[PDB]
Amino acid sequence: VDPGPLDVTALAVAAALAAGLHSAADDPAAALDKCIVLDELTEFAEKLVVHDRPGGIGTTVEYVEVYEDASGVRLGTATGNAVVLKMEPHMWQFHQSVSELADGSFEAVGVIDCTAMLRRMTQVLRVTGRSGRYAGKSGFMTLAISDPNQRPPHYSVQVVLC
Amino acid sequence: VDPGPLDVTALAVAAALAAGLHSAADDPAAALDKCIVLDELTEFAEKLVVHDRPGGIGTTVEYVEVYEDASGVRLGTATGNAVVLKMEPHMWQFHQSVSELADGSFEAVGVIDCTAMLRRMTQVLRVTGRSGRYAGKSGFMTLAISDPNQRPPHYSVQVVLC
């Protein structure tokens, strides 16, 4: 049960590569300054609405999550749905959210393995800018459970868009 | 060291969701019939050109992979690159590939924890059609390693495209 995290630079390069810049793998440093980086965020459920389904598969969750920086001051919210695709022996979900910050907003899509996140694996979603500073940009977001014993769960988050 | 897996129906729903309808969330049979499904695929390298960089980070890989069915007959090839992002404690890579079958072609992009794949975890990429029947469709593909000790590795693969 070993964490395997991903740092911002690494995530920034992947965002830059997926974006189209092959300059990225060569020059790690050059990626970041061009890219939009959000580090040291925590995300947690402010409100969850579960629509269960027999045995879990199809179960839908509408959520509103809050982004806190390193002081515990809100930076934005994420709003969206999660659908349960599998239960056993790993729980899997589909996620789609729109995150609104001061600067603007972006969208997040992905397929998360919850079970793996609880064994401290980092998970990834695709990010796409929607408005403001983020418009036209695209990226990735990493999700990591700080401590699996704590409920409600809290997540460490990074987002890079290029 | 425990999986992990994600079945094809569950995958088709994720594909259908991201693609479009929320009908997919509930009624899965609908997704499956509407969408394109490649199952029972085995993938391995026909050739690998590694361009190392000191310490691993930025090690670029160029590859031609081959898709076999359950009869060990080729269905297509995947031609791509991989860029190492992090080595420790987990190895991560960015992958981007064009895959060519008879029917058409599609692209695949994502960020794989290689290490977790050796704990027999399923990894997921985002897929997009490019040619032929696949054109204009979208989805996901999964990867898992059959035997972590087996060398070179063989990956079990599914692709669903909606």
From Swiss-Prot, chains A, B:
EC numbers: 5.-.-.-
Q: Kindly indicate whether the keyword Isomerase belongs to this entry.
A: yes
Q: List the disulfide bonds.
A: C35-C162
Binding of (1S,3R,6R,8R,9R,11R,14S,15S,19R,20R)-8-ethyl-9,15-dihydroxy-3,4,6,20-tetramethyl-21,23-dioxo-24-azapentacyclo[20.2.1.0(1,6).0(11,20).0(14,19)]pentacosa-4,12,22(25)-trien-25-olate occurs at Q93
Judged by the first EC level, this protein's enzyme class is isomerase
InterPro entries according to UniProt = AOC-like (IPR041013)
Q: Does the keyword Cell inner membrane apply?
A: no
- Catalytically driven reaction(s): 4-[(1R,2R,4aS,5S,8aR)-2-[(2R,3R,5E,7E)-3-ethyl-2-hydroxy-5,7-dimethylnona-5,7-dien-1-yl]-5-hydroxy-1-methyl-1,2,4a,5,6,7,8,8a-octahydronaphthalene-1-carbonyl]-2-methylidene-5-oxo-2,5-dihydro-1H-pyrrol-3-olate = (1S,3R,6R,8R,9R,11R,14S,15S,19R,20R)-8-ethyl-9,15-dihydroxy-3,4,6,20-tetramethyl-21,23-dioxo-24-azapentacyclo[20.2.1.0(1,6).0(11,20).0(14,19)]pentacosa-4,12,22(25)-trien-25-olate
Alphabetically list the UniProt keywords.
Antibiotic biosynthesis, Disulfide bond, Isomerase
Q: State the Gene Ontology BP annotations.
A: antibiotic biosynthetic process
Q: In which pathway does it act?
A: Antibiotic biosynthesis
Summarize the record's disruption phenotype note. Cells lacking this gene lose the ability to produce pyrroindomycins.
* GO MF terms, alphabetically ordered: isomerase activity
The miscellaneous remark of the record is: Reaction occurs via a unique trapping mechanism whereby the lid-like action of the N-terminal tail imposes conformational constraints on the beta-barrel catalytic core, which enhances the proximity and polarization effects of reactive groups (1,3-diene and alkene) to drive cyclization in a regio- and stereo-specific manner.
Subunit structure and binding partners: Homodimer.
What function does the entry list? Involved in the biosynthesis of the spirotetramate antibiotics pyrroindomycins. Catalyzes the intramolecular cyclization forming the spiro-conjugate moiety in pyrroindomycins, via an exo-selective [4+2] cycloaddition reaction.
- Quote the entry's note on domains: The N-terminal 10-AA residues are absolutely required for enzymatic activity.
Protein name stated in the entry: Spiro-conjugate synthase
Q: Which gene name belongs to this protein? A: pyrI4
